[model samples]
Target chain A: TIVNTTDDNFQADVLDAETPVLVDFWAGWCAPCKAIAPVLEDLSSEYAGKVKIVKVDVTSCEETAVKYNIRNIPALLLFKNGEVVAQQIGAVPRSKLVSFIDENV
Target chain B: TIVNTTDDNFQADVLDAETPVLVDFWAGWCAPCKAIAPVLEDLSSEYAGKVKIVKVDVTSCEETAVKYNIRNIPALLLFKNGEVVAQQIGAVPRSKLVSFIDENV
Candidate 1:
């Protein structure tokens, strides 16, 4: 249930999100990004109605990718009140991600 | 095959290896870390004799993780002559990873 986002909806889905949003910045060339996909899917269900989980493809969405200064794939950005409050650099476990979301919320 | 490295063998397997080495830093709690396991195994054979592929579990090997400044699981590091030459943050496609290694080798 992870929402696919692009420059078209970056503002609406994330910046303007009513609740805190977790944005996954990734690309097709990245193996680790593919590996993390399922974990995010599970989190979407577990955190539904509380935290919004969204994804942005760095390949297709160049604008947002550059705007965020994303030099790496599978980077997780936590946004609260339209600003990036936290950043995570690599693939991690569900429990760690849970803590990441909980801390932000 | 990919060698499992611990604090005990980090220097022998990586730092002193003659060929370039790629180390996958991971922890059991991280799902993406698990997801990329197969890819690394296949790469070991493909790149055998040219490069050595290894892994480090962050949960158990705190010393190496701390020394390397590893904040995330599934982080990839390329080493030459025991020095870090490059870094990759996430799981990416095998082709891209091949390039990452090729570029260094």
Candidate 2:
């Protein structure tokens, strides 16, 4: 299962992550997120031992969403070490996702 | 005379003018805007024949406020030949205002 993170794990698990992390900010009602779910799983497998992909469900992790200034659903935050490298505000394609993470982390 | 410009004349008066223009984004209910009215008049006289100061009451020009993405009252926009040079978001000291205009225009 993908690492389900909250505001609590955000600092230690995501920021200080030994490997780079791709954070997908999603909501249960977001259709685009469901569309990208399988893609994320596929990528999770492709990059399996290289990086960490975490999903934060806004309903459960309100603090995480607010801390990252997520005003819209399906926003993605890309991080390396402890700093944010980039953020996307809407649902994006896997190719776009690949480029964003590759260039940022 | 000072030009009390609206969204309509904003283009002609501020952007196309021969000299740089200082557009004051203000509102009727804002006490800070009232306090700065005299300061604007003083600067208008001191810089007489050099630059133009246009007062835009935010309440009266909703379209202008929205066009410029003005979220607050008493904001300032410095313009040169119709292009925005700089902006300040809140009530500032007179010297701060002077330097903002001097450096920008």
Candidate 3:
């Protein structure tokens, strides 16, 4: 399932994931990100078992979003062992997303 | 020389320096940093020939300030080979400032 987490689930799903988490910091109002939603879905399926792919809506999860400095829309952040290892800015194709994930997870 | 740079001269002075630049991102209103000013002068003398130590008043150099994401005052950013390698937040003791510069430069 493509799970969406808000401020409501901040501590449980994202900060508490045991394995490396790929956080796609997306917002609905961002047009560029809206176009790349399908790519993220595919990634979630591919990396399901290896890494925890979680989506955090910047609009509602203001606290967590601020910690990560989510300035651009459709930002991809990789966290491992409770530290941010890599991040991507803007919307990209599936291959780019996969490569971004590869760089981290 | 303790130089003051505005937005107009931000890129010219801060970005185009010749050595590994240790930029002191300070503002007038930040009390914690003001306390550490004397320490900065002393360290500036000790590391004179090796590193380029410069100060940018964030309120004045709004453009370059924004590029560096200087939300807080007294931020110490280390630029080696034109890329940021180290950064520290808030005001600390002279020993801490010396320690940060020593580690980077």
Candidate 4:
């Protein structure tokens, strides 16, 4: 399952998570961001327990977006132990997204 | 002036431009993208005739975003004679943006 994160909960949901966290920085108006939603949802189920998949609406969570330097939509960032480990930007293919998770988590 | 380009006008606006073109891929909901608007507006005037500044809303121009492999907001790309010459991702400082143009154009 995917967790929707916000500026207030980001610190607890992502930074303090026990498992590897995949943060999806997105916005409602971005087409490519919308395009990648299902892929991430699928991944959340597939990688459950091992990796925590979360979404952050850039517009709603402007502080989190600014803190993470997320200037782009659908920016995926991997976090482990409160630190960012890997990042991917864009609406990439399902395979590429899987590879990103595999390589990092 | 900053020309608003769409999927339909990308070719004529950027590819066919007589001068070097700075294409900004942005979205309405992206804060960083909005943050860079004034800086670009200033540069548009400063670089008048020397370079053409244009904007492509990733939300409305998904086709162009895909064509350009844009994964992020505020993705700045420089095109000369119909080819991309340089690229910068994320919301950077005005000085850095100026340097990016100076180095490319």
Candidate 5:
């Protein structure tokens, strides 16, 4: 399952997680974000324990979004060892999404 | 005023407009798109007859969004004489937004 992280729990949920975490910076009204939801869900199960998938709503988690300098919706940041290892902007196709995680993890 | 364009009227409202048109591809649920609304409104009046500002809801105007390859919310496209002259992705600050239109138009 994809985890929902916030400013309060971000440190523990993503930064401190055991596996590499893909943080999707999104909003409730972002069409691209919604478009990628199912793809992310499938990725969450495919990657399973190897990599973790999480989402942060830019509206509700302002601090986290600002800290990440997220200027766009569906900004995917890959974290490993509490550091951002890879990042991608926009809603890419399933192949690209898979490539992003595969290359990073 | 910022005119709302759809797949149906895009040709008449933007492509054939006399003035240069700034097309904002956005969605209601996008936070950054919302954040830049006031800025765009201000610009709409500032530029007035020099440039026309229009908005296309990605959800409602799927054809236009697809044709423009808008994979992100708040994608700004500057159109002149039925062709896209320049494009910018994401919600940029007022200065950059101004620069985008200024440089293009």
Candidate 6:
């Protein structure tokens, strides 16, 4: 399932996930966030066994925001074994998003 | 002056500069930031009249970081008329930096 992550559980959910993780740092006000949500949801199913996709709300999770230096919304971080390996900023198409995950995971 | 800029003066120094500006988003602990400092310093002098080069330590300028969506250290942003025209993600050579500025400004 597509999981909702926060600063509190980011460690267990992302850093420790059995698979590589795609973390989305976003805000409620971000249109691209909503637009991309379904894509992630589909990927959560499409890439079900391959990768984990989760979302973090910057407004609610200040610690995660500051720790990651996430100055912009709708930011995506591709993590593997607890380290960020790649990053994508702004809204992108499904093809790019898939390639982003494929390259990292 | 090749100024040390914080979030406080970011608006006046960068956004309002009559000339094109280059902003380095960096941190003290980052080696790449150290690597590029001298280059920016030299450029500040070389392009003194043509461009304004400034630095913002993400450790201090939290708001600016959030505003710029800076996900990584040693990030270089080229600005024209208060808008970001181009960006370099990692520590690159002086030649590349020059071309980055040359292409934008």
Judged by lDDT relative to the true structure, which candidate is superior, 3 or 6? 6
**Between the candidate structures 3 and 5, which one is better when assessed by lDDT?**
5
User: Across residues A1-105, which tens digit of lDDT does each residue of candidate 2 receive?
Assistant: 478888788787788887878888775545567778898888888888776889987656766776777545567787887877788766778899788767775
Candidate 5 local lDDT, B11-84, one digit each (tens): 99999987999999886656789889999999999998899999997657767886877657788999999999
Off by over 4 Å in 2: A1-105
Q: Please provide, for model 2 over B5-84, each residue's C-alpha lDDT reduced to its tens digit, 9 standing for 90 to 100.
A: 98888888887897988888765444576778998999999898877899986545767876877655477888877888
* Model 6, span A6-29: residue lDDT tens: 778999989987688889876544
CAPRI band for model 3: incorrect
Clashing pairs in 4: A72-B73
Q: Could you give me the TM-score of model 6 versus the true structure? A: 0.52
Point out where model 3 deviates above 4 Å.
B1-105
Ranking by TM-score: 4, 5, 6, 1, 2, 3
Compose the digit string of candidate 6's lDDT tens values, residues B25-64.
8755456678888888889998988988888876567678
What ordering of candidates by lDDT runs from best to worst?
A: 5, 4, 1, 6, 2, 3
- Kindly report the root-mean-square deviation of model 5 from the true structure over all alpha carbons: 7.9
Report the lDDT tens digits of candidate 4 across residue range B22-86.
Answer: 99988766778889999999999999999999999776676787678755677899999999999
Query: Worst lDDT window (10 residues) for model 1 chain A?
Result: A65-74
Tens-digit per-residue lDDT, A21-75, candidate 5: 9999876556788889999989889989899899997656867876877766779
The local lDDT score (0 to 100) that residue A18 gets in candidate 2 is 74
lDDT, candidate 4, equals 0.85
Candidate 5, A62: how far from true, in Å? 21
Assess candidate 5 and give its TM-score to the true structure: 0.57
Q: Give the DockQ-based CAPRI class for model 5.
A: incorrect
TM-score of chain B of each: 0.94, 0.93, 0.85, 0.97, 0.97, 0.93
Error of 1 at A85 (Å): 24
Better of 2 and 5 by lDDT: 5
lDDT of each: 0.81, 0.77, 0.71, 0.85, 0.86, 0.80
Clashing pairs in 5: A29-B29
